[PDB]
Amino acid sequence: KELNDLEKKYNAHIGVYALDTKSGKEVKFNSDKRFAYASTSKAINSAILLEQVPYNKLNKKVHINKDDIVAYSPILEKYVGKDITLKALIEASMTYSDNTANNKIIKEIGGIKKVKQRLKELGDKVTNPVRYEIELQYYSPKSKKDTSTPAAFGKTLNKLIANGKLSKENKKFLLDLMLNNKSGDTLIKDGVPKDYKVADKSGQAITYASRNDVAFVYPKGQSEPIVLVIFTNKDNKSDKPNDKLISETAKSVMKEF
């Protein structure tokens, strides 16, 4: 199935970057075009924090007040005036896509500027974090704010997590959250073969049908992962996205491996 054909069928724009970490073979399609990354950045922020906090120290607590709360914080709203461990913060952001948990994580790292700084060091000059949740969800094709390209985002996910500086315990804790996440069952998880294990983080911005999924894919019989970045959008501001597009893009791309 050709990807050009998939863009016509759904009337959408597809951006893909896949890297087999075993062979180093790559599959690219509009892999240098910018798209809003939305909530898939939650994975990037959790990883960056886990580089500076050992597994044994995730029990450490942070205080949450009224001022921290942003829209769509299903777990964090129950914590106003309370303390929460860093472990529970990462779980709320990854599993429930909690917006307040993500802003607090970025604060712990030091703020948007420390995140950007870390990306530079990893060699990522493209990913451009500017706003916190939920302003980062307001995408305009005329702005570079909070956008990245499928190639830049995928090489960063490979460096941070697959070939990164995480300890065994931290890497496993994070990947297990991503494997047991039920929010991405309609995406990459829906299009790859049944024997394949998929650890993903999905995303949806408010405008232009911005629907994304990023994953670590384990083919039956291979312990090294295939990193898979799928960013898609439509032409009108108010377009509603169709998840089958991403399931189909994933089935089509996996045929190359």
Side-chain angles (χ1 to χ4, degrees):
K1 192 79 102 276
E2 187 46 32
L3 265 24
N4 273 313
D5 251 25
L6 277 180
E7 282 188 330
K8 154 227 294 229
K9 167 170 176 180
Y10 286 96
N11 188 39
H13 307 277
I14 295 168
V16 179
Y17 178 81
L19 155 78
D20 185 352
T21 65
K22 188 181 196 189
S23 64
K25 182 191 183 180
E26 293 166 301
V27 162
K28 303 185 185 200
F29 188 75
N30 292 326
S31 68
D32 289 322
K33 182 165 147 224
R34 283 182 178 283
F35 285 88
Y37 50 64
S39 280
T40 66
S41 61
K42 296 214 214 301
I44 288 197
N45 303 321
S46 300
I48 288 177
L49 183 72
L50 295 171
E51 282 184 316
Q52 48 189 253
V53 181
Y55 189 76
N56 49 306
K57 293 158 200 179
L58 287 167
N59 75 130
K60 151 173 173 184
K61 281 159 174 140
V62 290
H63 186 71
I64 300 293
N65 71 3
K66 237 290 179 185
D67 297 322
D68 291 307
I69 306 303
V70 290
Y72 210 58
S73 308
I75 303 298
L76 269 285
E77 61 185 62
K78 280 55 195 262
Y79 284 79
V80 176
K82 295 177 167 41
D83 298 290
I84 188 182
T85 55
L86 296 179
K87 183 175 195 262
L89 275 170
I90 291 150
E91 296 176 328
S93 176
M94 299 304 284
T95 301
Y96 293 91
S97 216
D98 189 297
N99 290 319
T100 300
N102 184 59
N103 282 349
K104 250 296 160 168
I105 288 168
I106 294 166
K107 293 292 194 178
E108 289 297 313
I109 298 169
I112 292 226
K113 215 62 259 287
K114 271 233 169 294
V115 166
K116 175 159 263 310
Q117 190 178 122
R118 182 68 194 115
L119 298 169
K120 290 303 83 51
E121 298 171 5
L122 285 176
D124 179 349
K125 301 295 129 69
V126 189
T127 301
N128 186 41
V130 173
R131 293 167 295 180
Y132 281 80
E133 303 278 11
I134 58 158
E135 284 147 77
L136 72 84
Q137 320 280 13
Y138 284 116
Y139 167 64
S140 168
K142 298 306 179 297
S143 181
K144 280 145 71 143
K145 310 222 269 44
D146 314 299
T147 56
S148 188
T149 63
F153 208 83
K155 293 168 202 179
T156 286
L157 272 179
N158 176 51
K159 296 194 197 210
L160 272 170
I161 298 155
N163 229 223
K165 19 304 285 183
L166 299 201
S167 59
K168 239 63 220 187
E169 297 78 3
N170 271 350
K171 186 164 167 169
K172 158 163 223 283
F173 165 64
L174 189 71
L175 298 186
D176 295 344
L177 289 172
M178 289 176 76
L179 282 146
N180 291 309
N181 168 36
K182 308 267 135 200
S183 283
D185 283 348
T186 50
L187 308 160
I188 287 161
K189 288 177 192 202
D190 185 80
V192 308
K194 233 296 171 295
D195 41 308
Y196 288 37
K197 274 204 294 144
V198 183
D200 85 302
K201 182 65 187 79
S202 64
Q204 205 193 325
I206 281 157
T207 55
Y208 300 84
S210 296
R211 194 47 173 146
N212 308 321
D213 202 24
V214 302
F216 289 103
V217 180
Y218 300 91
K220 183 244 218 319
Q222 189 170 311
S223 56
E224 308 94 322
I226 298 189
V227 182
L228 186 51
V229 175
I230 300 174
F231 287 164
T232 69
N233 61 29
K234 298 178 76 162
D235 289 310
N236 312 311
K237 179 160 172 187
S238 56
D239 284 345
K240 306 194 281 181
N242 192 341
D243 283 1
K244 253 289 167 181
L245 169 55
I246 293 176
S247 181
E248 285 204 71
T249 293
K251 183 160 312 189
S252 179
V253 168
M254 278 324 277
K255 294 187 176 314
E256 300 303 289
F257 301 102

